[PDB]
Write a protein that binds this ligand. Structure first.
Ligand SMILES: Cn1sc(=O)n(Cc2ccccc2)c1=O
Ligand SMILES: *[C@@H]1O[C@H](CO)[C@@H](O)[C@H](O)[C@H]1NC(C)=O
Length: 344
């Protein structure tokens, strides 16, 4: 189990003004630290955020959080479940800012909600330095869904923070799971643009300088922000991601898929594969699914005979090509479940 700690700086808050926090399990014999960002969509105006507060309140408030949480998948401490990093120090950061981890705005007389995701990450890192992070050799910032996009938006800021604080020896890296989306045409971007204004959202500096004022929404799309980043980032993305298909208005019912939808789905997979061609650390199976790294059976899927925990181990070796230890693993077959190892 990982144990809850509420932030000592109580000005860094969830949406409703309650303190943000993190869950921690220390591993005294390890200099590896894994910090995982939870996902869970977002909200982008007063009415939409009010609705989320009625029925998704744990994603907006710490008042009802439990004292402990069980680590699963990459957060498990058992080697059978986690062949990659089972002995690491484990941190789960709850998503309670509804801002894709981008916000820097407090609750006040003018703002019904606080959007502080970018500041929550920085404050967690600062408070962990007194609990052993100061001795780390590697800090892996990981995340799923909105948390995977959050990795892309925040990994270089964590690296800059540790450099300015006097810890240049800590190697900061990212692992973005299910957060690499396409700004494509629907089968049958404005919400992000609205959200950034509502949240006072912030994006990485080099990407901001390319796209300039009013166009910062572009930096939420992986294929546009990734080339601007300096820290090493491993990208995990299903080729037929269920969240991508939902926003594209695609719903599979079991009836025969006709030609127009067949071509739409095939072109989506081809476009995703194209955006990953120049991403040297990546894992992209031809499956219809969403999220993987904190699932207990994350060990089961393979691309070209290599599992995700193996690919991450090969990535670690590469950061010290490798015979029999690949790091770039993208399926080429063109339809969901053409890979036999896809989740059932
Ligand atoms: C395909 N999809 S899915 C989704 O949620 N969005 C909006 C969004 C984009 C980047 C980061 C967070 C949210 C898309 O364009
Ligand atoms: C608490 O957090 C706020 C917001 O990031 C910051 O302005 C302030 O300096 C912090 N205070 C301390 C003591 O860390």
């Amino acid at each position: 189990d990982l144990r809850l700690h509420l932030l000592l700086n109580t000005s860094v808050t969830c949406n409703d003004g309650s303190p943000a926090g993190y869950y921690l399990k220390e591993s005294r014999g390890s200099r590896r630290w894994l910090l995982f960002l939870e996902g869970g969509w977002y909200c982008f105006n007063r009415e939409n955020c009010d609705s989320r507060y009625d029925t998704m309140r744990r994603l907006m408030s710490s008042r009802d959080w439990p004292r402990t949480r069980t680590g699963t998948g990459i957060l498990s401490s058992q080697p059978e479940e986690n062949p990659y990093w089972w002995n690491a120090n484990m941190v789960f950061i709850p998503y309670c800012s509804s801002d894709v981890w981008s916000g820097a705005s407090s609750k006040s007389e003018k703002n019904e909600y606080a959007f502080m995701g970018a500041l929550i990450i920085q404050e967690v890192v600062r408070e962990l330095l007194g609990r052993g992070l100061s001795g780390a050799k590697v800090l892996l910032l990981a995340g799923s869904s909105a948390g995977g996009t959050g990795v892309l938006l925040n990994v270089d800021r964590v690296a800059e923070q540790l450099e300015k604080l006097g810890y240049p020896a800590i190697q900061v890296r990212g692992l973005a799971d299910s957060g690499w989306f396409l700004d494509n045409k629907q089968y049958r971007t404005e919400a992000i643009r609205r959200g950034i204004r509502y949240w006072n959202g912030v994006v990485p500096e080099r990407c901001r300088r390319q796209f300039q004022e009013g166009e910062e929404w572009n930096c939420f799309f992986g294929y546009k922000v990734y080339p601007t980043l300096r820290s090493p980032v491993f990208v995990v993305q299903w080729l037929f991601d269920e969240a991508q298909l939902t926003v594209d208005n695609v719903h599979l019912t079991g009836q025969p898929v006709q030609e127009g939808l067949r071509l739409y789905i095939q072109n989506l997979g081809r476009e995703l594969r194209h955006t990953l061609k120049d991403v040297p650390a990546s894992f992209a199976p031809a499956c219809l699914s969403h999220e993987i790294i904190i699932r207990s059976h994350w060990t089961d899927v393979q691309v070209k005979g290599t599992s995700l925990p193996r690919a991450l181990h090969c990535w670690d070796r590469s950061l010290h090509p490798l015979k029999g230890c690949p790091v770039h693993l993208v399926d080429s077959c063109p339809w969901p479940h053409c890979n036999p190892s896809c989740p059932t």
